[PDB]
A paper describes a structure:
Among the 16 TCSs in S. aureus, WalKR (YycGF, VicKR and MicAB) is the only essential TCS involved in diverse cellular processes, including cell wall metabolism, virulence regulation, biofilm production, oxidative stress resistance and antibiotic resistance via direct or indirect regulation of autolysins, the saeRS TCS, haemolysins as well as other key virulence factors13. Here we report the crystal structure of erWalK, revealing a canonical Per-Arnt-Sim (PAS) domain for signal recognition.
However, the highly anisotropic property of the diffraction data prevented further data processing, which was likely ascribed to the presence of imperfect crystals formed by a mixture of different forms (monomer and dimer) of erWalK6 protein. Further screening of single amino-acid mutants of erWalK6 yielded the construct erWalK6R86M (Arg86 was mutated to Met) that not only exhibited a single peak in size exclusion chromatography analysis (R86M in Supplementary Fig. 1a) but also was crystallized with the crystals diffracting to 1.7 Å resolution. Each monomer adopts a canonical PAS domain fold with the presence of five central antiparallel β-strands in a topological order of 2-1-5-4-3. The ends of each monomer are two long helices, directly linking to the transmembrane helices, possibly bridging signal transduction from the extracellular receptor domain to the intracellular kinase domain. The mutation site MSE86 is located in the loop region between the second α-helix and the first β-strand with the side chain of MSE86 facing outwards. Therefore, this mutation is less likely to change the overall structure of the protein, but may contribute to the crystallization. The salt bridges between E91 and R93, K138 and E167, and the hydrogen bonds between Y165 and E167, Y140 and E167 stabilize the ligand-free conformation.
Residue numbers in the entry:
A (entry chain A): 6 to 152
B (entry chain B): 6 to 40, 42 to 152
């Protein structure tokens, strides 16, 4: 059962980090209001994305506009619509969600775990944190030990 | 207590890898020997490729260091471990852990030391000693101000 255990531990880890980012962003809104908070989002995103297991974090507003990213090579996405059904689901339901994707970042299609956590202020959704996490590091290690 | 959760998560990961390595080593004893030894080195090496593991050593029941994953520590092979945590795992037949500070070249870093004994029949034949890079957790905690 080693595979399920390691994947669950990887996901649990990302989710506990992401929750604290969500709480952090919420506190900035509670303290500063929406106009001034929306400028402290980038630093939080970037601090969190330093973790080895996180590929990219985006913050997406209520209207599905990409506000910020931690990936400099994706600066062209800022102010575009996310056009992402999983993001729409989180925004509408106010619930987290997750799924696996294949994505080629330059080395061939890699397995990537996508987690969305909506950001709530006064119980209302204001946006969504979208995370691409490097779950292929788990699969790669399992293959290396023949499990 | 993000901090306790994240530390716990790291340690569970290590402990679940280390349990499978113990099982694998035990298997190779059951069904070969030693002298199993090349197969033991390959197992240690595969396991040490994970990012969060610094070094793995396999120590026999007389406390001799039999194998390491770290090239620069080959001089340790055939020496006594002279390590009280290793002695504890051998004597008690249960895992143990503790934190150390160790300077690998970049200054003293927090390192999590985990020992799991290896048993054949139900008798201790050795011990797996692991140094793990728990300072990756503390570094990230400080980076997010938690």
């Amino acid at each position: 059962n080693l595979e399920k255990e390691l994947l669950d531990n990887f996901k649990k880890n990302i989710t506990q980090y992401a929750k604290q980012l969500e709480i952090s962003i919420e506190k900035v809104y509670d303290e500063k209001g929406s106009v001034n908070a929306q400028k402290d989002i980038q630093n939080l995103l970037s601090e969190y994305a330093n973790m080895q297991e996180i590929g990219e974090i985006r913050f997406i507003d209520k209207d599905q506009i990409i506000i910020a990213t931690t990936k400099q090579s994706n600066r062209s996405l800022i102010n575009q619509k996310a056009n992402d059904s999983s993001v729409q689901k989180a925004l509408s339901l106010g619930q987290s969600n997750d799924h696996l994707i294949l994505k080629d970042y330059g080395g061939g299609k890699d397995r990537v775990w996508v987690y969305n956590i909506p950001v709530k202020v006064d119980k209302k959704v204001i946006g969504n944190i979208y995370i691409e996490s490097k779950i292929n590091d788990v699969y790669n290690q399992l293959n290396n030990i023949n499990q």
